[PDB]
Amino acid sequence: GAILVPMTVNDQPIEKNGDKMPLKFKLGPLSYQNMAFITAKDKYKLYPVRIPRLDTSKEFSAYVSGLFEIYRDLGDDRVFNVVNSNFAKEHNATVNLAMEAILNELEVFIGRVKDQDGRVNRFYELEESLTVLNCLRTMYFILDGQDVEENRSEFIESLLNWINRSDGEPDEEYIEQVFSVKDSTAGKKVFETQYFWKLLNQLVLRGLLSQAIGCIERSDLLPYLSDTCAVSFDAVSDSIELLKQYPKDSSSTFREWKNLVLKLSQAFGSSATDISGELRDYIEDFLLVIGGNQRKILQYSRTWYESFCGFLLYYIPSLELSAEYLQMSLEANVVDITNDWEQPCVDIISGKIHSILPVMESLDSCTAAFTAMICEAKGLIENIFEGEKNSMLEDLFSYRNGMASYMLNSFAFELCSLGDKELWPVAIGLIALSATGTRSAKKMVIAELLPHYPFVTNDDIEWMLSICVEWRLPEIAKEIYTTLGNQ
Amino acid sequence: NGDKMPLKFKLGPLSYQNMAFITAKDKYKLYPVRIPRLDTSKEFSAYVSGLFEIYRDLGDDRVFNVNSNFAKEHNATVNLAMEAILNELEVFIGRVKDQDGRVNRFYELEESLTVLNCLRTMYFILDGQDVEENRSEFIESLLNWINRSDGEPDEEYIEQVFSVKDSAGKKVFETQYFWKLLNQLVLRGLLSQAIGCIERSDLLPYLSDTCAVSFDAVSDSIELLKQYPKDSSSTFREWKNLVLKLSQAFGSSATDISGELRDYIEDFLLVIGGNQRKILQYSRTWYESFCGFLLYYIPSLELSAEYLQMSLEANVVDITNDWEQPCVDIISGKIHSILPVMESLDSCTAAFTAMICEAKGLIENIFEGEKNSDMLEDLFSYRNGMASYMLNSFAFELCSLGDKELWPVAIGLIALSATGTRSAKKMVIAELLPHYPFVTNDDIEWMLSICVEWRLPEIAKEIYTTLGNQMLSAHN
Amino acid sequence: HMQPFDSGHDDLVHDVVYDFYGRHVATCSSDQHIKVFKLDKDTSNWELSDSWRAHDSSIVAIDWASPEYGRIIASASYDKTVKLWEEDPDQEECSGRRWNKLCTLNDSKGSLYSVKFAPAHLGLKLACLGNDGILRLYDALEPSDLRSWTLTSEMKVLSIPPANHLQSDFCLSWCPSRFSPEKLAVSALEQAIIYQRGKDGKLHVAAKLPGHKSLIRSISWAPSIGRWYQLIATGCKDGRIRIFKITEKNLQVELLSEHDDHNGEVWSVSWNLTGTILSSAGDDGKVRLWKATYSNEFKCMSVITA
Secondary structure: OOOOOOOOOOOOOOOOOOOOOOEEEEEEEEOOEEEEEEOOOOOOEEEOOOOOOOOOOHHHHHHHHHHHHHHHHOHHHHOOOOOOOHHHHHHHHHHHHHHHHHHHHHHHHHHHHHHHOOOOHHHHHHHHHHHHHHHHHHHHOOOOOOOHHHHHHHHHHHHHHHHHHHOOOOOHHHHHHHOOOOOOOOOOOOOOOHHHHHHHHHHHHOOOHHHHHHHHOOOOHHHHHHHOOHHHHHHHHHHHHHHOOOOOOOHHHHHHHHHHHHHHHHHHHOOOOOOOHHHHHHHHHHHHHHHOOHHHHHHOOOOHHHHHHHHHHHHOOOHHHHHHHHHHHHHHOOOOOOOOOHHHHHHHHOOOOHHHHHHHHHHOHHHHHHHHHHHHHHOOOOOOOOOOOOOOOOOOOOOOOOHHHHHHHHHHHHHHOOOOOOOHHHHHHHHHHOOOOOHHHHHHHHHHHHHHOOOOOHHHHHHHHHHHHHHOOHHHHHHHHHHHHOO | OOOOOOEEEEEEEEOOEEEEEEOOOOOOOEEOOOOOOOOOOHHHHHHHHHHHHHHHHOHHHHOOOOOOHHHHHHHHHHHHHHHHHHHHHHHHHHHHHHHHOOOHHHHHHHHHHHHHHHHHHHHOOOOOOOHHHHHHHHHHHHHHHHHHHOOOOOHHHHHHHOOOOOOOOOOOOOOHHHHHHHHHHHHOOOHHHHHHHHOOOOHHHHHHHOOHHHHHHHHHHHHHHOOOOOOOHHHHHHHHHHHHHHHHHHHOOOOOOOHHHHHHHHHHHHHHHOOHHHHHHOOOOHHHHHHHHHHHHOOOHHHHHHHHHHHHHHOOOOOOOOOHHHHHHHHOOOOHHHHHHHHHHOHHHHHHHHHHHHHHOOOOOOOOOOOOOOOOOOOOOOOOOHHHHHHHHHHHHHHOOOOOOOHHHHHHHHHHOOOOOHHHHHHHHHHHHHHOOOOOHHHHHHHHHHHHHHOOHHHHHHHHHHHHHHOOOOOO | OOOOEEOOOOOOEEEEEEOOOOOEEEEEEOOOEEEEEEEOOOOOOEEEEEEEEOOOOOEEEEEEOOOEOEOEEEEEEOOOOEEEEEEOOOOOOOOOOOEEEEEEEOOOOOOEEEEEEOOHHHOOEEEEEEOOOEEEEEEOOOOOOOOOOEEEEEEEOOOOOOOOOOOOOEEEEEOOOOOOOOEEEEEEOOEEEEEEEOOOOOEEEEEEOOOOOOOEEEEEEOOOOOOOOEEEEEEEOOOOEEEEEEEEOOEEEEEEEEEOOOOOOEEEEEEOOOOOOEEEEEOOOOEEEEEEOOOOOEEEEEEEOO
């Protein structure tokens, strides 16, 4: 479960099962500069080691600053009160926007990371972190507890986006994989392979209608059909017509859309069979899936999230059924433990949000911190903890306050050892704005952190002081000064 | 056996009387079949009536409004109704054990109760607050939930290790078996028993003699156990104090005992002090861990999330029984997913459970599906609540039961359904009522009073038409 | 770069220590030398600032004083002494003449294994412990005279029953906390005890960290920024890392975690600057980093290797 880093891959000191050597390690004031060494004969090298998976990049600090801005800008809205009628509506308004802001900052970050190194282990983790976030927004930061009818456009957009950014498939490297034109069976037409259809339904199940249409106009739209069976040519054609106008704004237009689709599947259902025994069904199924047949939507689904997505798109677009959709989907395809995002999404969808934080904290401490923060703002997680008979116990950094407060404060502390003076304001601000904890408890924490601020400029020093003023730690200012003279 | 024969089956107007038969030569028997796992008992209908009373009595409070006392007073009554429900079910389980024994139905009903105990302990006592809000009630419910879920440690296992079976010269308690069963008792709050198992072998024996130092630990430790706080979260704060003092004193002191007996006593003291590492070590099931954490480490539900996680890393959920997973779900926040499982144990319990969870406001109707609407009778769909759904299903299920005593419950349940048009309900009653198994005059008058109350003219007209032939010519 | 480098020591190296800013490191070995390395800003490489012979015997411990008292290092050797040095910026680096001895403490009648400066909020103060089993605190009463080192206290930790020959390890670690009463931890063989300043200005034993079933190779008090309780970790020879939660309501002692992941002796135990991460190293030739759970248990967040 832990990261087994290669201290100094090129030259490692311990090798023999022999004399179990006395290895010593000391964590340095700087995250990126620690040290390992050995108290043994002929082992006089010092090994500077930096903490496993630490982000020193400029792209990262930009990300951190960006997120801190959103946090600060949220003002009173970063808190949730368990102007009268509207405070409720206006609150979500801003929170939902901040969620968008967070998502944005992370996409940008992921962008600057792909250009910098390309596809490093860090890139993968950040995308996973984003996938879990897309899913989270799609389920709680759009409809505000209402149903898809409340805003069909936004919802389906987020859903369709979440799904088509989670994994790469169907990757165009697989599109050509089946369009190999390999005729290794007497007359293997351009589609008579279940392979063709599965990949057509898959496209439909994922809302990828554009591509879906293309794969059809690829082989036998007019070909085998406009010729062989004129009846089924009309189905496969005006079906492609309906796909072209799948409603994404009016839950009314969809109600009527599913109508024409069900009419079409019934007409074709009992009609002129002038095609192969297989091609017959392969078209019914395509039409069943588009109509929402639950049995079928599960059949042509490769992963639970394809099923879940399909259900909402073609069966009944109501979150009141997500509980059932999720269950059926998972009975069909289990959660894939290969990647770290699937389970968190299953948790989100199924109501237990709090349990995505531990996993996201593994992908990236920062994202996790602010994610937890905005979830508290929305009021999706709260501090259940309580006090005593009205009576010290001022340990800010604990389970006493929120799970969010905890994560934010930890991130602050983590920033302090990063040695980037740009983020120190973020660190202190994060602590200062912590919605929980005594003004005095905070005073002490700042009183101990500040002395470590990596000041160099005059402006830097003035900043330290302004904070000693703002918090009343004059004795501490007179101390950083005692280092100036004797520096 | 393998003769492909045309089997035919027809569901009857009465749940308990269906029929199977075969269209084949020399197969002229008729097989009356009753629906699998159907409750016809009197004990059951009593249960149903009892639960319907609580539902009816909840009045406006069976609904949840998304005057500063209305909030506090609301929980007051709901939390009581939850207790009422639990009671009615215990009684039911009781009358079932006496009547039929430990049959399949008994097991399922207890499972159903376990899941309910757990549910109460987590949402119908503290009302979102922490254990300090009411340490007594909470720990009581918790300790109860745990010691009714499974039987172990069953006294059939207590004697199992006190077998006095000496086979490498056992010292009766120098055995690892003895301790695990002592810690187990502690982890489950079973302190009385815990003390007894000690005063069983070497309290004064090996100890009062061998090492006078460790005799004092093992003794005044048993003293602290005797006064584990269950009312003041203050007294506990101080209790854990003396316990931690004790473990430190003993921690570094006179080792006048066996190398093993040395540690076996530290661990006992560590567990009582709340060492997380240890509480997990001597736990056989996740729920023993979870329970221990709350009893000896930190009594705060703000940590349940973590407690549950650690507990499950130590011992996975046992799929043998149907109650464990639902409890894991309860504890971990997703309540809604216990309903499907409870519905399998007993449709009735599940129905009302879902009901009171809506009353508490633990589950609500998220649905909203039209801006264009006005016939779409849906009293029986996903359109309304998950609770509304379950209550209405139960009502319909009652109608085929043929017990005229429950028909009022059936109709009442439909009539009080907090969702659905007065007209939608009118139609549903209009179709069900004709099936009422009336016999008395009072029965008939009841049917009619319902036709009046709902204005089902053309229906009271058929009841009477059947009556013009079964009332104008039957009661002769 | 981040590749290894030679210390320049002939005999085994005992301790490596960081200055306040994390940009400097002091090294001491058996070859009786103290080397100081500088982390060049431009070329992110560590480069020797000065080396020099400092003791007549093997130098085992070392430590920097708070920057608000100047550039000061302290050393403990088997030659029964503790020496203090101050950097003279007016000397070329590598000259062997960049650090001037400010004093020598000869009170110890047995070799010395550890020396740690106290938290700055208490003045230039320090402690040391050796074979004589007597912990000694020294104070630079007048911060102007970095030679004016008086002896503040002497405490008998152990009964000194083992000739220097019989396995004898000792460790020190002060409580860093600025808003907590003065106190420090001391390990002497199997035992590990905590001292606290009384109202009478004398050290008294306020508690013990029970459970160690062998020699305590290392211990360190963690920075309690934010928390109200204290945490001190110990790496024992029995192959276990232990983390004790110490609360004063007078001192309570809880054992939070135990970890044998190392399967062999844990030689080094170190903390974060925020006391947010804890490190352990041992026989298995691996370094492990530990973070605290929300429940206050400790979890291995990573394993660095050899």
